[PDB]
Amino acid sequence: DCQVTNPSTGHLFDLSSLSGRAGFTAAYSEKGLVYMSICGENENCPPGVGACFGQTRISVGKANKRLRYVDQVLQLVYKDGSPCPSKSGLSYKSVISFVCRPEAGPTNRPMLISLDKQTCTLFFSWHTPLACE
């Protein structure tokens, strides 16, 4: 249910306050965006899809709720997106990484920071106080 524990302190991280089908957007390119929900599908995307391009609604990853803890970062990986334009045989995937930010940012939305074209992986970051222990 969108929660994970730091194996070494027992601290429970809960990202459920960011969950839900309404979700968020992240800026893509110059005027575009990506629609995304946390730990579940997004209402603007095809059924079961957690993140998709806003212009086309094409999937960049199927939703899941497998939140993981790795070196102080909480992460989700939505795989099995649509066919990769840059490499035959591959499907888009979205990695969403939550990092502690003691004070919430002025905008406070996820950011698409990189798109690895060789593997069609979209890397997103969200610096949030919910990732602080």
UniProtKB/Swiss-Prot annotation:
PTM text: Palmitoylated. Undergoes cysteine S-palmitoylation which promotes interaction with the retromer cargo-selective complex which mediates its retrograde trafficking to the Golgi apparatus.
Subcellular location as annotated: Golgi apparatus membrane; Endosome membrane
Protein name, per record: Cation-independent mannose-6-phosphate receptor
Domain note: Contains 15 repeating units of approximately 147 AA harboring four disulfide bonds each. The most highly conserved region within the repeat consists of a stretch of 13 AA that contains cysteines at both ends.
Disulfide bonds: 2-39, 45-52, 84-120, 100-132
Included range, full protein: 1515 to 1647 of 2491
Superkingdom assignment: Eukaryota
Assembly description: Binds HA-I and HA-II plasma membrane adapters. Interacts with DPP4; the interaction is direct. Binds GGA1, GGA2 and GGA3. Interacts with the heterotrimeric retromer cargo-selective complex (CSC), formed by VPS26 (VPS26A or VPS26B), VPS29 and VPS35; which is involved in retrograde trafficking of the receptor from endosomes to the Golgi apparatus.
Residue stretches making up the MRH domain: 1-133
Function: Mediates the transport of phosphorylated lysosomal enzymes from the Golgi complex and the cell surface to lysosomes. Lysosomal enzymes bearing phosphomannosyl residues bind specifically to mannose-6-phosphate receptors in the Golgi apparatus and the resulting receptor-ligand complex is transported to an acidic prelysosomal compartment where the low pH mediates the dissociation of the complex. The receptor is then recycled back to the Golgi for another round of trafficking through its binding to the retromer. This receptor also binds IGF2.
Protein family membership: Belongs to the MRL1/IGF2R family.
Gene designation: IGF2R
